[PDB]
Amino acid sequence: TKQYEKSENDLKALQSVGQIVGEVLKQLTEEKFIVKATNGPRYVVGCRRQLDKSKLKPGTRVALDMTTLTIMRYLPREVDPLVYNMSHE
Amino acid sequence: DLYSRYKKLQQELEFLEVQEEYIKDEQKNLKKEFLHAQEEVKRIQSIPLVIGQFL
């Protein structure tokens, strides 16, 4: 009964939309950083207030907001095929 | 007649004088409104702005 409500409160976090993946290309100023969508449009947006550009760097896989498109979170490395070529024994 | 029209010639003179200080204060306030319009066009627009391929 309580764990079901926990999954309900889990779902109370899920209405928040997922951000858009991004690759920081380069930067211009502290409010302007060259970024492109995976579909090709290039943008310049502002960051969030926790980060330093040492946590970004140019040529970095990142994420942007869905409206303001602001730089928020990120991961440096991802890909589909790599580990799935490993598993033949 | 001479003194008559002589007393008639400072009417429009003082009227143009109060128009001077008027239009001065007018274009002073409208100037600050144009400076406000400069704050608009310099605020306009974005941040964030999509760059594009120019020909």
mmCIF file of N, CA and C in Angstrom:
data_model
loop_
_atom_site.group_PDB
_atom_site.id
_atom_site.type_symbol
_atom_site.label_atom_id
_atom_site.label_comp_id
_atom_site.label_asym_id
_atom_site.label_seq_id
_atom_site.Cartn_x
_atom_site.Cartn_y
_atom_site.Cartn_z
ATOM 1 N N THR A 1 0.830 -1.198 0.000
ATOM 2 C CA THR A 1 0.000 0.000 0.000
ATOM 3 C C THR A 1 0.868 1.254 0.000
ATOM 4 N N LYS A 2 1.868 1.277 0.884
ATOM 5 C CA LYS A 2 2.775 2.418 0.952
ATOM 6 C C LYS A 2 3.763 2.417 -0.206
ATOM 7 N N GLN A 3 4.235 1.236 -0.610
ATOM 8 C CA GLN A 3 5.155 1.157 -1.741
ATOM 9 C C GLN A 3 4.472 1.535 -3.048
ATOM 10 N N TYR A 4 3.170 1.256 -3.170
ATOM 11 C CA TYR A 4 2.437 1.688 -4.353
ATOM 12 C C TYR A 4 2.370 3.208 -4.428
ATOM 13 N N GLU A 5 2.111 3.865 -3.293
ATOM 14 C CA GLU A 5 2.149 5.323 -3.256
ATOM 15 C C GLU A 5 3.551 5.848 -3.534
ATOM 16 N N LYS A 6 4.582 5.096 -3.144
ATOM 17 C CA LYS A 6 5.946 5.485 -3.486
ATOM 18 C C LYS A 6 6.151 5.479 -4.995
ATOM 19 N N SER A 7 5.615 4.467 -5.681
ATOM 20 C CA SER A 7 5.639 4.471 -7.138
ATOM 21 C C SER A 7 4.749 5.569 -7.704
ATOM 22 N N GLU A 8 3.703 5.957 -6.968
ATOM 23 C CA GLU A 8 2.922 7.125 -7.358
ATOM 24 C C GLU A 8 3.740 8.399 -7.197
ATOM 25 N N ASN A 9 4.419 8.547 -6.056
ATOM 26 C CA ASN A 9 5.321 9.678 -5.879
ATOM 27 C C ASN A 9 6.504 9.600 -6.833
ATOM 28 N N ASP A 10 6.933 8.387 -7.192
ATOM 29 C CA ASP A 10 7.847 8.241 -8.320
ATOM 30 C C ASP A 10 7.264 8.887 -9.565
ATOM 31 N N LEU A 11 5.989 8.604 -9.855
ATOM 32 C CA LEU A 11 5.355 9.193 -11.028
ATOM 33 C C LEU A 11 5.116 10.685 -10.848
ATOM 34 N N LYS A 12 5.127 11.174 -9.606
ATOM 35 C CA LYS A 12 5.028 12.612 -9.401
ATOM 36 C C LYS A 12 6.311 13.325 -9.815
ATOM 37 N N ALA A 13 7.396 12.580 -10.042
ATOM 38 C CA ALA A 13 8.609 13.183 -10.582
ATOM 39 C C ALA A 13 8.688 13.073 -12.097
ATOM 40 N N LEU A 14 7.806 12.282 -12.713
ATOM 41 C CA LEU A 14 7.964 11.927 -14.116
ATOM 42 C C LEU A 14 7.215 12.857 -15.052
ATOM 43 N N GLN A 15 6.339 13.713 -14.530
ATOM 44 C CA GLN A 15 5.663 14.662 -15.406
ATOM 45 C C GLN A 15 6.652 15.692 -15.942
ATOM 46 N N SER A 16 7.737 15.934 -15.210
ATOM 47 C CA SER A 16 8.804 16.775 -15.726
ATOM 48 C C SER A 16 9.380 16.169 -16.999
ATOM 49 N N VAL A 17 9.440 16.987 -18.050
ATOM 50 C CA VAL A 17 9.852 16.497 -19.355
ATOM 51 C C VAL A 17 11.359 16.259 -19.366
ATOM 52 N N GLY A 18 11.783 15.288 -20.169
ATOM 53 C CA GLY A 18 13.199 15.049 -20.337
ATOM 54 C C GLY A 18 13.836 16.086 -21.242
ATOM 55 N N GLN A 19 15.068 16.456 -20.905
ATOM 56 C CA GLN A 19 15.769 17.473 -21.668
ATOM 57 C C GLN A 19 16.196 16.925 -23.030
ATOM 58 N N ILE A 20 16.830 17.788 -23.806
ATOM 59 C CA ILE A 20 17.319 17.447 -25.135
ATOM 60 C C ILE A 20 18.818 17.199 -25.054
ATOM 61 N N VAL A 21 19.276 16.121 -25.694
ATOM 62 C CA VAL A 21 20.712 15.880 -25.754
ATOM 63 C C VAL A 21 21.380 16.986 -26.559
ATOM 64 N N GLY A 22 22.657 17.207 -26.268
ATOM 65 C CA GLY A 22 23.402 18.233 -26.968
ATOM 66 C C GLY A 22 24.881 17.926 -26.967
ATOM 67 N N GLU A 23 25.573 18.525 -27.927
ATOM 68 C CA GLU A 23 27.027 18.521 -27.967
ATOM 69 C C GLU A 23 27.474 19.974 -27.943
ATOM 70 N N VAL A 24 28.102 20.396 -26.844
ATOM 71 C CA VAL A 24 28.713 21.716 -26.839
ATOM 72 C C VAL A 24 29.799 21.723 -27.900
ATOM 73 N N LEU A 25 29.694 22.650 -28.848
ATOM 74 C CA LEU A 25 30.676 22.722 -29.925
ATOM 75 C C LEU A 25 31.856 23.590 -29.504
ATOM 76 N N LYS A 26 31.620 24.886 -29.339
ATOM 77 C CA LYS A 26 32.583 25.819 -28.767
ATOM 78 C C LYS A 26 31.799 26.857 -27.973
ATOM 79 N N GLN A 27 32.472 27.932 -27.570
ATOM 80 C CA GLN A 27 31.831 28.965 -26.769
ATOM 81 C C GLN A 27 32.156 30.339 -27.338
ATOM 82 N N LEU A 28 31.403 31.336 -26.872
ATOM 83 C CA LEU A 28 31.599 32.719 -27.290
ATOM 84 C C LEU A 28 31.819 33.596 -26.063
ATOM 85 N N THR A 29 30.807 33.696 -25.204
ATOM 86 C CA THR A 29 30.900 34.395 -23.929
ATOM 87 C C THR A 29 30.295 33.504 -22.849
ATOM 88 N N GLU A 30 30.257 34.007 -21.612
ATOM 89 C CA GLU A 30 29.722 33.214 -20.511
ATOM 90 C C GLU A 30 28.220 32.990 -20.628
ATOM 91 N N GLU A 31 27.514 33.807 -21.407
ATOM 92 C CA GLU A 31 26.111 33.561 -21.713
ATOM 93 C C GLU A 31 25.887 32.930 -23.083
ATOM 94 N N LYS A 32 26.939 32.711 -23.873
ATOM 95 C CA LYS A 32 26.794 32.254 -25.253
ATOM 96 C C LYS A 32 27.796 31.144 -25.536
ATOM 97 N N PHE A 33 27.289 29.960 -25.879
ATOM 98 C CA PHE A 33 28.120 28.794 -26.149
ATOM 99 C C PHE A 33 27.611 28.111 -27.406
ATOM 100 N N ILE A 34 28.513 27.832 -28.345
ATOM 101 C CA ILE A 34 28.104 27.202 -29.597
ATOM 102 C C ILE A 34 27.673 25.772 -29.303
ATOM 103 N N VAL A 35 26.426 25.452 -29.646
ATOM 104 C CA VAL A 35 25.856 24.127 -29.439
ATOM 105 C C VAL A 35 24.985 23.800 -30.641
ATOM 106 N N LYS A 36 24.865 22.509 -30.937
ATOM 107 C CA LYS A 36 24.058 22.045 -32.054
ATOM 108 C C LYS A 36 23.170 20.896 -31.603
ATOM 109 N N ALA A 37 21.961 20.853 -32.151
ATOM 110 C CA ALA A 37 21.102 19.699 -31.965
ATOM 111 C C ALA A 37 21.597 18.540 -32.823
ATOM 112 N N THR A 38 21.189 17.326 -32.443
ATOM 113 C CA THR A 38 21.548 16.152 -33.229
ATOM 114 C C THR A 38 20.993 16.220 -34.648
ATOM 115 N N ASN A 39 19.977 17.048 -34.880
ATOM 116 C CA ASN A 39 19.388 17.227 -36.199
ATOM 117 C C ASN A 39 19.977 18.406 -36.962
ATOM 118 N N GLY A 40 20.989 19.077 -36.416
ATOM 119 C CA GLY A 40 21.738 20.058 -37.166
ATOM 120 C C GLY A 40 21.587 21.547 -36.877
ATOM 121 N N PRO A 41 20.498 22.017 -36.255
ATOM 122 C CA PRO A 41 20.443 23.450 -35.923
ATOM 123 C C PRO A 41 21.450 23.804 -34.839
ATOM 124 N N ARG A 42 22.186 24.891 -35.063
ATOM 125 C CA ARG A 42 23.196 25.367 -34.129
ATOM 126 C C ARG A 42 22.648 26.528 -33.312
ATOM 127 N N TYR A 43 22.953 26.525 -32.016
ATOM 128 C CA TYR A 43 22.416 27.507 -31.090
ATOM 129 C C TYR A 43 23.534 28.056 -30.215
ATOM 130 N N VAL A 44 23.232 29.164 -29.541
ATOM 131 C CA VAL A 44 24.044 29.681 -28.445
ATOM 132 C C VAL A 44 23.105 30.025 -27.298
ATOM 133 N N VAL A 45 23.340 29.417 -26.137
ATOM 134 C CA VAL A 45 22.449 29.534 -24.990
ATOM 135 C C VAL A 45 23.274 29.890 -23.761
ATOM 136 N N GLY A 46 22.583 30.118 -22.646
ATOM 137 C CA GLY A 46 23.246 30.313 -21.379
ATOM 138 C C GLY A 46 23.323 29.031 -20.578
ATOM 139 N N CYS A 47 24.252 29.001 -19.629
ATOM 140 C CA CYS A 47 24.431 27.821 -18.801
ATOM 141 C C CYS A 47 23.538 27.896 -17.568
ATOM 142 N N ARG A 48 23.582 26.843 -16.756
ATOM 143 C CA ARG A 48 23.053 26.931 -15.410
ATOM 144 C C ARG A 48 24.120 27.544 -14.505
ATOM 145 N N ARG A 49 23.772 27.761 -13.241
ATOM 146 C CA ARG A 49 24.640 28.520 -12.354
ATOM 147 C C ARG A 49 25.592 27.656 -11.535
ATOM 148 N N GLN A 50 25.446 26.330 -11.565
ATOM 149 C CA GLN A 50 26.365 25.478 -10.818
ATOM 150 C C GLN A 50 27.673 25.240 -11.566
ATOM 151 N N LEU A 51 27.634 25.213 -12.894
ATOM 152 C CA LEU A 51 28.758 24.740 -13.680
ATOM 153 C C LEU A 51 29.822 25.819 -13.862
ATOM 154 N N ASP A 52 31.047 25.358 -14.088
ATOM 155 C CA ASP A 52 32.107 26.142 -14.699
ATOM 156 C C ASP A 52 32.384 25.565 -16.079
ATOM 157 N N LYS A 53 32.844 26.413 -17.001
ATOM 158 C CA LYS A 53 33.138 25.914 -18.340
ATOM 159 C C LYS A 53 34.259 24.880 -18.343
ATOM 160 N N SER A 54 35.016 24.766 -17.248
ATOM 161 C CA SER A 54 35.945 23.652 -17.103
ATOM 162 C C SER A 54 35.202 22.331 -16.946
ATOM 163 N N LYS A 55 33.948 22.380 -16.501
ATOM 164 C CA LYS A 55 33.103 21.196 -16.472
ATOM 165 C C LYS A 55 32.418 20.946 -17.811
ATOM 166 N N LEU A 56 32.553 21.871 -18.762
ATOM 167 C CA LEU A 56 31.970 21.719 -20.092
ATOM 168 C C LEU A 56 33.052 21.440 -21.130
ATOM 169 N N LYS A 57 33.857 22.448 -21.489
ATOM 170 C CA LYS A 57 34.853 22.426 -22.561
ATOM 171 C C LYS A 57 34.176 22.380 -23.926
ATOM 172 N N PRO A 58 34.835 22.865 -24.976
ATOM 173 C CA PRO A 58 34.289 22.705 -26.326
ATOM 174 C C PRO A 58 34.392 21.261 -26.793
ATOM 175 N N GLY A 59 33.487 20.894 -27.696
ATOM 176 C CA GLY A 59 33.427 19.529 -28.184
ATOM 177 C C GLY A 59 33.028 18.550 -27.098
ATOM 178 N N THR A 60 31.932 18.841 -26.398
ATOM 179 C CA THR A 60 31.515 18.062 -25.241
ATOM 180 C C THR A 60 30.056 17.657 -25.374
ATOM 181 N N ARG A 61 29.785 16.372 -25.163
ATOM 182 C CA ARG A 61 28.415 15.880 -25.132
ATOM 183 C C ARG A 61 27.711 16.395 -23.883
ATOM 184 N N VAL A 62 26.553 17.031 -24.071
ATOM 185 C CA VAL A 62 25.861 17.730 -22.990
ATOM 186 C C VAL A 62 24.355 17.593 -23.157
ATOM 187 N N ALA A 63 23.603 18.386 -22.394
ATOM 188 C CA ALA A 63 22.159 18.465 -22.534
ATOM 189 C C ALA A 63 21.721 19.916 -22.395
ATOM 190 N N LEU A 64 20.550 20.217 -22.955
ATOM 191 C CA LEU A 64 19.990 21.559 -22.915
ATOM 192 C C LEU A 64 18.551 21.491 -22.427
ATOM 193 N N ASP A 65 18.038 22.640 -21.996
ATOM 194 C CA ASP A 65 16.645 22.739 -21.589
ATOM 195 C C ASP A 65 15.731 22.567 -22.800
ATOM 196 N N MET A 66 14.464 22.249 -22.529
ATOM 197 C CA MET A 66 13.489 22.061 -23.595
ATOM 198 C C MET A 66 12.845 23.361 -24.062
ATOM 199 N N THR A 67 13.015 24.457 -23.322
ATOM 200 C CA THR A 67 12.465 25.743 -23.736
ATOM 201 C C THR A 67 13.566 26.793 -23.822
ATOM 202 N N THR A 68 14.115 27.181 -22.668
ATOM 203 C CA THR A 68 15.243 28.104 -22.649
ATOM 204 C C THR A 68 16.462 27.514 -23.345
ATOM 205 N N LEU A 69 16.512 26.189 -23.487
ATOM 206 C CA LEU A 69 17.631 25.465 -24.087
ATOM 207 C C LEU A 69 18.932 25.694 -23.329
ATOM 208 N N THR A 70 18.840 26.060 -22.054
ATOM 209 C CA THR A 70 20.025 26.395 -21.280
ATOM 210 C C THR A 70 20.848 25.148 -20.975
ATOM 211 N N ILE A 71 22.163 25.337 -20.863
ATOM 212 C CA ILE A 71 23.044 24.227 -20.515
ATOM 213 C C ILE A 71 22.794 23.852 -19.062
ATOM 214 N N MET A 72 22.422 22.591 -18.830
ATOM 215 C CA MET A 72 22.119 22.121 -17.481
ATOM 216 C C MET A 72 22.965 20.907 -17.117
ATOM 217 N N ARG A 73 22.662 19.732 -17.654
ATOM 218 C CA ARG A 73 23.369 18.505 -17.318
ATOM 219 C C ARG A 73 24.016 17.931 -18.577
ATOM 220 N N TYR A 74 24.642 16.766 -18.431
ATOM 221 C CA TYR A 74 25.609 16.315 -19.422
ATOM 222 C C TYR A 74 26.110 14.929 -19.044
ATOM 223 N N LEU A 75 26.685 14.240 -20.033
ATOM 224 C CA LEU A 75 27.549 13.094 -19.802
ATOM 225 C C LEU A 75 28.623 13.130 -20.878
ATOM 226 N N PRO A 76 29.876 12.800 -20.544
ATOM 227 C CA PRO A 76 30.938 12.910 -21.557
ATOM 228 C C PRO A 76 30.866 11.861 -22.651
ATOM 229 N N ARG A 77 30.501 10.622 -22.320
ATOM 230 C CA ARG A 77 30.670 9.498 -23.230
ATOM 231 C C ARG A 77 29.424 8.623 -23.254
ATOM 232 N N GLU A 78 28.979 8.278 -24.461
ATOM 233 C CA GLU A 78 27.893 7.328 -24.662
ATOM 234 C C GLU A 78 28.013 6.746 -26.063
ATOM 235 N N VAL A 79 27.391 5.578 -26.255
ATOM 236 C CA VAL A 79 27.203 4.978 -27.577
ATOM 237 C C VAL A 79 26.418 3.680 -27.422
ATOM 238 N N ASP A 80 25.724 3.265 -28.485
ATOM 239 C CA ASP A 80 24.995 1.999 -28.514
ATOM 240 C C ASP A 80 25.871 0.762 -28.732
ATOM 241 N N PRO A 81 26.631 0.672 -29.836
ATOM 242 C CA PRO A 81 27.125 -0.647 -30.275
ATOM 243 C C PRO A 81 28.227 -1.242 -29.419
ATOM 244 N N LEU A 82 29.021 -0.426 -28.723
ATOM 245 C CA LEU A 82 30.295 -0.856 -28.152
ATOM 246 C C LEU A 82 30.209 -2.142 -27.336
ATOM 247 N N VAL A 83 29.557 -2.078 -26.174
ATOM 248 C CA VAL A 83 29.564 -3.207 -25.247
ATOM 249 C C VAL A 83 28.835 -4.409 -25.840
ATOM 250 N N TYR A 84 27.910 -4.180 -26.766
ATOM 251 C CA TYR A 84 27.120 -5.264 -27.336
ATOM 252 C C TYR A 84 27.878 -6.051 -28.394
ATOM 253 N N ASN A 85 29.080 -5.613 -28.752
ATOM 254 C CA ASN A 85 30.007 -6.413 -29.537
ATOM 255 C C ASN A 85 30.900 -7.286 -28.660
ATOM 256 N N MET A 86 30.842 -7.107 -27.339
ATOM 257 C CA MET A 86 31.750 -7.786 -26.417
ATOM 258 C C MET A 86 31.305 -9.207 -26.089
ATOM 259 N N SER A 87 29.997 -9.460 -26.081
ATOM 260 C CA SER A 87 29.430 -10.530 -25.267
ATOM 261 C C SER A 87 29.563 -11.922 -25.874
ATOM 262 N N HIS A 88 30.140 -12.067 -27.063
ATOM 263 C CA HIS A 88 30.344 -13.400 -27.612
ATOM 264 C C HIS A 88 31.429 -14.128 -26.827
ATOM 265 N N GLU A 89 31.106 -15.323 -26.338
ATOM 266 C CA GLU A 89 32.005 -16.094 -25.491
ATOM 267 C C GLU A 89 32.296 -17.446 -26.128
ATOM 268 N N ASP B 1 -2.598 103.638 -31.986
ATOM 269 C CA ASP B 1 -2.333 102.568 -32.938
ATOM 270 C C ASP B 1 -0.912 102.035 -32.790
ATOM 271 N N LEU B 2 0.066 102.944 -32.790
ATOM 272 C CA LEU B 2 1.460 102.532 -32.652
ATOM 273 C C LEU B 2 1.696 101.841 -31.315
ATOM 274 N N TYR B 3 1.311 102.494 -30.215
ATOM 275 C CA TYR B 3 1.401 101.845 -28.909
ATOM 276 C C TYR B 3 0.440 100.668 -28.802
ATOM 277 N N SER B 4 -0.713 100.750 -29.467
ATOM 278 C CA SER B 4 -1.672 99.653 -29.504
ATOM 279 C C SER B 4 -1.028 98.386 -30.050
ATOM 280 N N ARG B 5 -0.599 98.422 -31.315
ATOM 281 C CA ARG B 5 0.038 97.249 -31.906
ATOM 282 C C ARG B 5 1.348 96.911 -31.206
ATOM 283 N N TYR B 6 2.016 97.906 -30.615
ATOM 284 C CA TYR B 6 3.208 97.619 -29.824
ATOM 285 C C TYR B 6 2.867 96.749 -28.623
ATOM 286 N N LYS B 7 1.731 97.011 -27.981
ATOM 287 C CA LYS B 7 1.252 96.129 -26.926
ATOM 288 C C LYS B 7 0.622 94.854 -27.469
ATOM 289 N N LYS B 8 0.431 94.753 -28.784
ATOM 290 C CA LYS B 8 -0.070 93.533 -29.401
ATOM 291 C C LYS B 8 1.032 92.604 -29.896
ATOM 292 N N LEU B 9 2.288 93.051 -29.917
ATOM 293 C CA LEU B 9 3.362 92.254 -30.493
ATOM 294 C C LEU B 9 4.084 91.369 -29.482
ATOM 295 N N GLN B 10 3.852 91.547 -28.183
ATOM 296 C CA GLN B 10 4.467 90.666 -27.198
ATOM 297 C C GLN B 10 3.585 89.480 -26.829
ATOM 298 N N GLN B 11 2.325 89.472 -27.264
ATOM 299 C CA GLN B 11 1.450 88.325 -27.056
ATOM 300 C C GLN B 11 2.047 87.078 -27.692
ATOM 301 N N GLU B 12 2.110 87.053 -29.027
ATOM 302 C CA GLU B 12 2.678 85.904 -29.723
ATOM 303 C C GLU B 12 4.149 85.698 -29.387
ATOM 304 N N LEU B 13 4.847 86.748 -28.952
ATOM 305 C CA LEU B 13 6.233 86.590 -28.525
ATOM 306 C C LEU B 13 6.316 85.753 -27.254
ATOM 307 N N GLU B 14 5.520 86.106 -26.241
ATOM 308 C CA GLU B 14 5.476 85.301 -25.024
ATOM 309 C C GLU B 14 4.843 83.941 -25.281
ATOM 310 N N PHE B 15 3.913 83.860 -26.237
ATOM 311 C CA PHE B 15 3.340 82.567 -26.593
ATOM 312 C C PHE B 15 4.391 81.667 -27.227
ATOM 313 N N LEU B 16 5.211 82.219 -28.122
ATOM 314 C CA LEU B 16 6.328 81.455 -28.663
ATOM 315 C C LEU B 16 7.387 81.170 -27.609
ATOM 316 N N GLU B 17 7.516 82.029 -26.596
ATOM 317 C CA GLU B 17 8.465 81.770 -25.519
ATOM 318 C C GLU B 17 8.022 80.588 -24.665
ATOM 319 N N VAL B 18 6.737 80.542 -24.299
ATOM 320 C CA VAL B 18 6.241 79.390 -23.559
ATOM 321 C C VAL B 18 6.203 78.153 -24.444
ATOM 322 N N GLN B 19 6.161 78.328 -25.769
ATOM 323 C CA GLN B 19 6.301 77.190 -26.670
ATOM 324 C C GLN B 19 7.737 76.684 -26.708
ATOM 325 N N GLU B 20 8.712 77.583 -26.559
ATOM 326 C CA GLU B 20 10.113 77.198 -26.457
ATOM 327 C C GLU B 20 10.325 76.246 -25.289
ATOM 328 N N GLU B 21 10.094 76.739 -24.069
ATOM 329 C CA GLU B 21 10.263 75.907 -22.881
ATOM 330 C C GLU B 21 9.395 74.657 -22.952
ATOM 331 N N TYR B 22 8.208 74.768 -23.552
ATOM 332 C CA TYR B 22 7.373 73.595 -23.792
ATOM 333 C C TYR B 22 8.111 72.561 -24.630
ATOM 334 N N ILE B 23 8.416 72.911 -25.883
ATOM 335 C CA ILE B 23 8.969 71.924 -26.801
ATOM 336 C C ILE B 23 10.324 71.437 -26.311
ATOM 337 N N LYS B 24 11.050 72.263 -25.554
ATOM 338 C CA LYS B 24 12.275 71.799 -24.914
ATOM 339 C C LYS B 24 11.978 70.664 -23.942
ATOM 340 N N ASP B 25 11.058 70.897 -23.003
ATOM 341 C CA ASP B 25 10.667 69.845 -22.071
ATOM 342 C C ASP B 25 9.993 68.688 -22.799
ATOM 343 N N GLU B 26 9.254 68.988 -23.870
ATOM 344 C CA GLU B 26 8.660 67.938 -24.691
ATOM 345 C C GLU B 26 9.730 67.001 -25.239
ATOM 346 N N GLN B 27 10.629 67.528 -26.074
ATOM 347 C CA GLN B 27 11.675 66.696 -26.657
ATOM 348 C C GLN B 27 12.694 66.222 -25.630
ATOM 349 N N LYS B 28 12.648 66.731 -24.399
ATOM 350 C CA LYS B 28 13.457 66.145 -23.333
ATOM 351 C C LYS B 28 12.843 64.842 -22.841
ATOM 352 N N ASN B 29 11.526 64.836 -22.615
ATOM 353 C CA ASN B 29 10.856 63.620 -22.167
ATOM 354 C C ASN B 29 10.790 62.590 -23.289
ATOM 355 N N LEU B 30 10.477 63.039 -24.507
ATOM 356 C CA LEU B 30 10.440 62.123 -25.644
ATOM 357 C C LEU B 30 11.827 61.572 -25.956
ATOM 358 N N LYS B 31 12.878 62.334 -25.650
ATOM 359 C CA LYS B 31 14.237 61.822 -25.807
ATOM 360 C C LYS B 31 14.482 60.646 -24.870
ATOM 361 N N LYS B 32 14.099 60.796 -23.598
ATOM 362 C CA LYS B 32 14.221 59.692 -22.655
ATOM 363 C C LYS B 32 13.333 58.520 -23.052
ATOM 364 N N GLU B 33 12.206 58.796 -23.714
ATOM 365 C CA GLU B 33 11.395 57.714 -24.258
ATOM 366 C C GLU B 33 12.087 57.038 -25.433
ATOM 367 N N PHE B 34 12.853 57.799 -26.224
ATOM 368 C CA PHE B 34 13.653 57.194 -27.280
ATOM 369 C C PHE B 34 14.832 56.415 -26.708
ATOM 370 N N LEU B 35 15.418 56.896 -25.609
ATOM 371 C CA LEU B 35 16.416 56.101 -24.902
ATOM 372 C C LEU B 35 15.797 54.822 -24.357
ATOM 373 N N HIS B 36 14.551 54.902 -23.885
ATOM 374 C CA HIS B 36 13.829 53.695 -23.493
ATOM 375 C C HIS B 36 13.606 52.782 -24.690
ATOM 376 N N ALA B 37 13.293 53.362 -25.853
ATOM 377 C CA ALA B 37 13.171 52.566 -27.069
ATOM 378 C C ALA B 37 14.505 51.951 -27.462
ATOM 379 N N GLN B 38 15.613 52.638 -27.173
ATOM 380 C CA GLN B 38 16.925 52.047 -27.402
ATOM 381 C C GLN B 38 17.162 50.867 -26.470
ATOM 382 N N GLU B 39 16.667 50.953 -25.232
ATOM 383 C CA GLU B 39 16.742 49.809 -24.330
ATOM 384 C C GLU B 39 15.895 48.652 -24.839
ATOM 385 N N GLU B 40 14.812 48.949 -25.562
ATOM 386 C CA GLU B 40 13.991 47.888 -26.134
ATOM 387 C C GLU B 40 14.732 47.174 -27.257
ATOM 388 N N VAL B 41 15.219 47.931 -28.245
ATOM 389 C CA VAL B 41 15.836 47.314 -29.415
ATOM 390 C C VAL B 41 17.140 46.620 -29.049
ATOM 391 N N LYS B 42 17.836 47.101 -28.015
ATOM 392 C CA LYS B 42 19.020 46.399 -27.536
ATOM 393 C C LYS B 42 18.667 45.191 -26.680
ATOM 394 N N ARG B 43 17.529 45.224 -25.982
ATOM 395 C CA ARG B 43 17.035 44.016 -25.327
ATOM 396 C C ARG B 43 16.582 42.994 -26.359
ATOM 397 N N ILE B 44 15.810 43.439 -27.345
ATOM 398 C CA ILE B 44 15.440 42.594 -28.467
ATOM 399 C C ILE B 44 16.713 42.050 -29.110
ATOM 400 N N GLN B 45 16.772 40.731 -29.256
ATOM 401 C CA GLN B 45 15.701 39.864 -28.775
ATOM 402 C C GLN B 45 16.226 38.708 -27.912
ATOM 403 N N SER B 46 17.055 37.862 -28.509
ATOM 404 C CA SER B 46 17.471 36.604 -27.922
ATOM 405 C C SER B 46 18.949 36.396 -28.258
ATOM 406 N N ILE B 47 19.788 35.769 -27.417
ATOM 407 C CA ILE B 47 19.561 35.208 -26.064
ATOM 408 C C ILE B 47 18.267 34.394 -25.814
ATOM 409 N N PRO B 48 18.247 33.120 -26.261
ATOM 410 C CA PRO B 48 19.163 32.451 -27.192
ATOM 411 C C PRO B 48 18.813 32.681 -28.650
ATOM 412 N N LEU B 49 19.817 32.787 -29.511
ATOM 413 C CA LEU B 49 19.593 33.132 -30.906
ATOM 414 C C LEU B 49 20.225 32.076 -31.802
ATOM 415 N N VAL B 50 19.440 31.546 -32.744
ATOM 416 C CA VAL B 50 19.949 30.504 -33.627
ATOM 417 C C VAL B 50 20.753 31.132 -34.756
ATOM 418 N N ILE B 51 22.022 30.749 -34.850
ATOM 419 C CA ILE B 51 22.883 31.199 -35.936
ATOM 420 C C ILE B 51 22.565 30.382 -37.179
ATOM 421 N N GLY B 52 22.781 30.976 -38.350
ATOM 422 C CA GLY B 52 22.377 30.342 -39.591
ATOM 423 C C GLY B 52 23.343 30.663 -40.710
ATOM 424 N N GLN B 53 23.169 29.953 -41.820
ATOM 425 C CA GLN B 53 24.159 29.918 -42.891
ATOM 426 C C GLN B 53 23.825 30.994 -43.919
ATOM 427 N N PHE B 54 24.662 32.024 -43.992
ATOM 428 C CA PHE B 54 24.377 33.206 -44.790
ATOM 429 C C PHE B 54 25.006 33.103 -46.173
ATOM 430 N N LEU B 55 24.284 33.614 -47.171
ATOM 431 C CA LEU B 55 24.696 33.521 -48.569
ATOM 432 C C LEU B 55 25.036 34.879 -49.167
#
